[PDB]
Amino acid sequence: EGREDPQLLVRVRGGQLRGIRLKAPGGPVSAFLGIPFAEPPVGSRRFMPPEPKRPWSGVLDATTFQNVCYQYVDTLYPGFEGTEMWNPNRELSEDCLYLNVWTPYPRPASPTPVLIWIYGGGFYSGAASLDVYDGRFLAQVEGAVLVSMNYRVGTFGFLALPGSREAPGNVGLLDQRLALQWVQENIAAFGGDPMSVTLFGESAGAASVGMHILSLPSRSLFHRAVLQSGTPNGPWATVSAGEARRRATLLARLVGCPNDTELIACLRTRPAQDLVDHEWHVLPQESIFRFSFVPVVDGDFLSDTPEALINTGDFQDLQVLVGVVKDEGSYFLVYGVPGFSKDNESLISRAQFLAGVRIGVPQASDLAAEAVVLHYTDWLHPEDPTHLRDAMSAVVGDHNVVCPVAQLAGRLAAQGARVYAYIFEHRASTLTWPLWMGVPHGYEIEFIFGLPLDPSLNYTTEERIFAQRLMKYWTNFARTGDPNDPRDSKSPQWPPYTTAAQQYVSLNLKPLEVRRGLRAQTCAFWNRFLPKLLSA
Amino acid sequence: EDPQLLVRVRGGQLRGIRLKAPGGPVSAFLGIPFAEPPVGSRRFMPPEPKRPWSGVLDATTFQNVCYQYVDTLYPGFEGTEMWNPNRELSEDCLYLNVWTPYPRPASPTPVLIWIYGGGFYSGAASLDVYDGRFLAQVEGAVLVSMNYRVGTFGFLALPGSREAPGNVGLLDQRLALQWVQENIAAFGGDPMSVTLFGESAGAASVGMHILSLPSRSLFHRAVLQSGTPNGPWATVSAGEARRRATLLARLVGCNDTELIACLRTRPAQDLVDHEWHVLPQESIFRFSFVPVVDGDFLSDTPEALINTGDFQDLQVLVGVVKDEGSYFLVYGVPGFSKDNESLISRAQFLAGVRIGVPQASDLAAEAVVLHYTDWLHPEDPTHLRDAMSAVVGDHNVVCPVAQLAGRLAAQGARVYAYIFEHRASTLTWPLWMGVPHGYEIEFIFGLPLDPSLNYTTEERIFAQRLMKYWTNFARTGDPNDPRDSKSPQWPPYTTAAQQYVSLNLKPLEVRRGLRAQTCAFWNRFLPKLLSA
Numbered sequence A: 001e002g003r004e005d006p007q008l009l010v011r012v013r014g015g016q017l018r019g020i021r022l023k024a025p026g027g028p029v030s031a032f033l034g035i036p037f038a039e040p041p042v043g044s045r046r047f048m049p050p051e052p053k054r055p056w057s058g059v060l061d062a063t064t065f066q067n068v069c070y071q072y073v074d075t076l077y078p079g080f081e082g083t084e085m086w087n088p089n090r091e092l093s094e095d096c097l098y099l100n101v102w103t104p105y106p107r108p109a110s111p112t113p114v115l116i117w118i119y120g121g122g123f124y125s126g127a128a129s130l131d132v133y134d135g136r137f138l139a140q141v142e143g144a145v146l147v148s149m150n151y152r153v154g155t156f157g158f159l160a161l162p163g164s165r166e167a168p169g170n171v172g173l174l175d176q177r178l179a180l181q182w183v184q185e186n187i188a189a190f191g192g193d194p195m196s197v198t199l200f201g202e203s204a205g206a207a208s209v210g211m212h213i214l215s216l217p218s219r220s221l222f223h224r225a226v227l228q229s230g231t232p233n234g235p236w237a238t239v240s241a242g243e244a245r246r247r248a249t250l251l252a253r254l255v256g257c258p259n260d261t262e263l264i265a266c267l268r269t270r271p272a273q274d275l276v277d278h279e280w281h282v283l284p285q286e287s288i289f290r291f292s293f294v295p296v297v298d299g300d301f302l303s304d305t306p307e308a309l310i311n312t313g314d315f316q317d318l319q320v321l322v323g324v325v326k327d328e329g330s331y332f333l334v335y336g337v338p339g340f341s342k343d344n345e346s347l348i349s350r351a352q353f354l355a356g357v358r359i360g361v362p363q364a365s366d367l368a369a370e371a372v373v374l375h376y377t378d379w380l381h382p383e384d385p386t387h388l389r390d391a392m393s394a395v396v397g398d399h400n401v402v403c404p405v406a407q408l409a410g411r412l413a414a415q416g417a418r419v420y421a422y423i424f425e426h427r428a429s430t431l432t433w434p435l436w437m438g439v440p441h442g443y444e445i446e447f448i449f450g451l452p453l454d455p456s457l458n459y460t461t462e463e464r465i466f467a468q469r470l471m472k473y474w475t476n477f478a479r480t481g482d483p484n485d486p487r488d489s490k491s492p493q494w495p496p497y498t499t500a501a502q503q504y505v506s507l508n509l510k511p512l513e514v515r516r517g518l519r520a521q522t523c524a525f526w527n528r529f530l531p532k533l534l535s536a
Numbered sequence B: 001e002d003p004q005l006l007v008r009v010r011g012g013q014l015r016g017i018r019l020k021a022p023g024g025p026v027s028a029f030l031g032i033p034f035a036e037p038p039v040g041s042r043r044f045m046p047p048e049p050k051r052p053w054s055g056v057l058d059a060t061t062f063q064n065v066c067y068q069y070v071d072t073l074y075p076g077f078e079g080t081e082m083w084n085p086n087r088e089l090s091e092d093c094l095y096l097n098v099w100t101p102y103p104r105p106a107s108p109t110p111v112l113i114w115i116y117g118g119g120f121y122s123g124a125a126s127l128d129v130y131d132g133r134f135l136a137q138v139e140g141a142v143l144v145s146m147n148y149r150v151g152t153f154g155f156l157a158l159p160g161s162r163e164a165p166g167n168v169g170l171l172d173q174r175l176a177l178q179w180v181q182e183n184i185a186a187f188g189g190d191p192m193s194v195t196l197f198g199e200s201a202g203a204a205s206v207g208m209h210i211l212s213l214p215s216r217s218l219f220h221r222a223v224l225q226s227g228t229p230n231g232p233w234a235t236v237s238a239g240e241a242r243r244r245a246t247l248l249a250r251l252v253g254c255n256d257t258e259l260i261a262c263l264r265t266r267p268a269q270d271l272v273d274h275e276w277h278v279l280p281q282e283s284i285f286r287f288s289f290v291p292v293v294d295g296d297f298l299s300d301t302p303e304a305l306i307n308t309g310d311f312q313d314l315q316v317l318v319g320v321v322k323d324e325g326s327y328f329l330v331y332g333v334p335g336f337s338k339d340n341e342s343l344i345s346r347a348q349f350l351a352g353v354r355i356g357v358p359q360a361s362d363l364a365a366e367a368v369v370l371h372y373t374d375w376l377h378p379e380d381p382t383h384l385r386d387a388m389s390a391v392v393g394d395h396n397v398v399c400p401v402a403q404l405a406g407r408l409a410a411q412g413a414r415v416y417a418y419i420f421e422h423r424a425s426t427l428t429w430p431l432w433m434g435v436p437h438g439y440e441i442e443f444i445f446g447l448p449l450d451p452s453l454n455y456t457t458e459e460r461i462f463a464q465r466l467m468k469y470w471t472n473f474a475r476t477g478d479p480n481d482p483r484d485s486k487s488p489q490w491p492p493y494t495t496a497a498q499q500y501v502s503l504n505l506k507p508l509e510v511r512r513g514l515r516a517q518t519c520a521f522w523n524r525f526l527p528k529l530l531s532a
């Protein structure tokens, strides 16, 4: 080894690693990027459960981010920062089952609580190596050990012919579980506490956290959970066995593959791009906020539908943090609903609102669509282009995030879980999306991870204090199961979400303000009445 | 012999009586016959014009109230007795009353005709809350009220028969309107400025004169207080009227002609005994014998006619009170009473919705319960009590009033809409019932001006304000004082801005949208639901 930094060499079960000494604004951090945790799921292993990574010889260099899992790449606004910030930033490859580890430098003295990040992106996209997921600040400022993994997305992650051995589905979720098993065995070599491990994720990542809560094998790999703008329940996170099967055989036919063994075998002989190129063509209706290849209700990972499982499972000794941004829906309108764009004020007509309701609520019958249209329209001003636009954003945001989270928060709480609920209401001063989109899906994240602390990034001073505050909320919750400061008593307190009072806090530049009722009236509509109306 | 009290009408001569109102005398002519007594074989039949009479007919006393069911639930309680008959019950009841300033107007004076309510099942014009002296003495109006047949006697129909063709109760009102046309000028009334105004079933009847072309030549303005021709309770189909007619006939021991004959040969109370037993469901705010869609008086359904008529030369004043439904809960809904606070459970609230909305399917009462629950306090006894009253009030008055106002304003009419929010200081109902169905009436008729009625000074001032709105409406079509130059004016209800005003002790305040989101639920979505 000779003349290396002796704080950057670490042994794990698979072999030796050499990490990197990164500069964060307020000190150095240790990072170990690109650690292989499964065998490359390539060739005859495509669509299959990850096998644990065979040990390697010598010191593995762990100083670069590894390849992004093969995925669709957004082409709507080329060069626009607001979309590129989510696109992959390393080479696309099916060999992509790697994870990353940030820790204080030097590595800590006492065993430190671990935070595991699961990125979002609709189960069709995402990478643990994007800039908004950079753990250098949570490590340096809060002392935390942060772990983020790559997991297979798209067809490679979730294409299922249920019941079969060569494509049993949910293998993307099995990637994440394997990374969690990896943390249990290895994170103490870095100073992490394998007995204090908190999952947290956004969008499909938040959804995934939910599925590890509900899948009994994952339950012994973590102890607390944070779900940001996403849920295992709801209309997009899961599909029936039947629908997954229909979506898989359609894609097979679309690439020329017509007994499931012979069909998957053919799929395994196709370039990764040919699958990506046809992935969006298997959706049943014209939709937004719908993704072709997502977790399946397999009767295995998910013993039953998430709706059934949250309704009837025991959840004491489980601490959860859940929340939403203010305008969950706005982002999705520009990827489908005619009339909407990032370059226009998107002032739409009544006609277009009704057309958009059928796209944002694609599974809805004619009557249920009318019901949605009746609820959201302002009958004092039923033709105002501005109320209609913002109403269209709210249909999509309520139906896909806010009311599922409301359903999850109330059903967990009724079943003994300590729940904490927020709404994130601050719009980044640096946002490049138009004002009409408000605080869109995903723009909490740069503040949880603490990017405002980077002087070069041009956030306001208050934005930097704000980001520090939510970093302490998230980390306090990872440490204690309670986002509140023990020492800071004078500060306004964050109370648990109860079925009786339904308290939640607002996250913005002002101090915490407590509110009652997660869009209670409107989510009674989506969570109670609407199921009974398509039940007839 | 006071010549002011001698009037010659087309049917002979009358003597009225001079009454004291607080600020002066009034000429009243009570008990004037306008039709042949619909007794014996003329039962269920259209009314016939009264034959002329000899000598000078005495019209100083109130004539009998039409035969009707009498309420029993709170015996001798002022809140209920005040609506109960205050003269003898008779089928010989087709008489009307005229009040006129003393001395009689020197110029043709606008006429106000009052059509009482009582669910098409009860009511009379001799009730003290319809006392016409105040409006005649203070605003100088000529005020007319008539009796019309109620219950089986007014509205039992075997449609398309000739012995019981339906709606004779409305043909009673119609004939009174024609009597006013032929005769009112003799009292100083202006037959060319006649405003109908009524409440509950009366407001509904006023609506049916708007929609029945033969009635249009007998009035020029209308006021519909807390009642409409559209909606769930004011009409039945011919199929359904025939059902209850033949059901009542089965129940009292009785081909159409023979069936209606037997019914004629039956003491009155024998028919009223079974009046309530022909409703198809357990109900509240539902009545056994109401106007029928006959293809005659009502060419189509009221919902179809408002959706399609031409109303350009029409001016209308429509409104509701704060707590329409609350009155009806004590009359059928388990858990509710005038004598406790009627705090109810969630299950009791589910059960009440199937009676407040008796026609609704499982899915539709589900929909109603989910809408009216306060999902922040879904089990709170007080929110459920207040929501049950709102369900009943919105389903039956507020939302029909909002649908009629919308259709009228859109199709050429001039609409002025109110919400009456003041609770009488003398009210004898419990505090939780708010301002119930029917308790604006005492203030429009000016009763607080009677000092022995122990109303508060501001309530006297408030009643005089309302009397001006109504009489100004009669003279002009516009309830706004043409002298008051002060800013808050009552604006016309429009489809675009949906403005209405609030009537209470504080000055007029203008609000937009008359329970807009909730009536979109009732008028737009719920129809789509049941019919699927």
Ligand SMILES: CCN(CC)CCNS(=O)(=O)Cc1ccc(C(F)(F)F)cc1
Pocket (backbone or CB within 6 Å): A072, A073, A074, A075, A076, A086, A119, A120, A121, A122, A202, A203, A289, A331, A332, A335, A441, A442
């Ligand atoms: C804003 C942060 N999120 C969550 C991490 C990432 C963006 N993907 S998204 O959320 O799921 C919204 C979206 C849907 C469909 C398309 C495409 F590619 F089909 F056009 C792009 C983006």
Ligand SMILES: CCN(CC)CCNS(=O)(=O)Cc1ccc(C(F)(F)F)cc1
Pocket (backbone or CB within 6 Å): B070, B071, B072, B083, B117, B118, B119, B123, B200, B285, B327, B328, B331, B437, B438
């Ligand atoms: C307060 C103003 N109104 C009309 C002027 C008086 C009561 N009739 S009402 O509105 O229709 C309410 C009511 C319904 C049914 C019953 C009974 F008798 F059948 F039980 C009594 C009272």
Ligand SMILES: *[C@@H]1O[C@H](CO)[C@@H](O)[C@H](O)[C@H]1NC(C)=O
Pocket (backbone or CB within 6 Å): A338, A339, A340, A341, A344, A345, A346, A347, A348
């Ligand atoms: C905004 O732009 C989109 C796409 O170019 C277009 O379809 C829409 O109609 C425009 N709307 C307005 C209000 O300019």
Ligand SMILES: *[C@@H]1O[C@H](CO)[C@@H](O)[C@H](O)[C@H]1NC(C)=O
Pocket (backbone or CB within 6 Å): A456, A457, A458
């Ligand atoms: C931040 O602001 C400086 C000017 O002070 C500018 O030169 C730089 O390019 C900006 N960077 C970003 C990422 O906006």
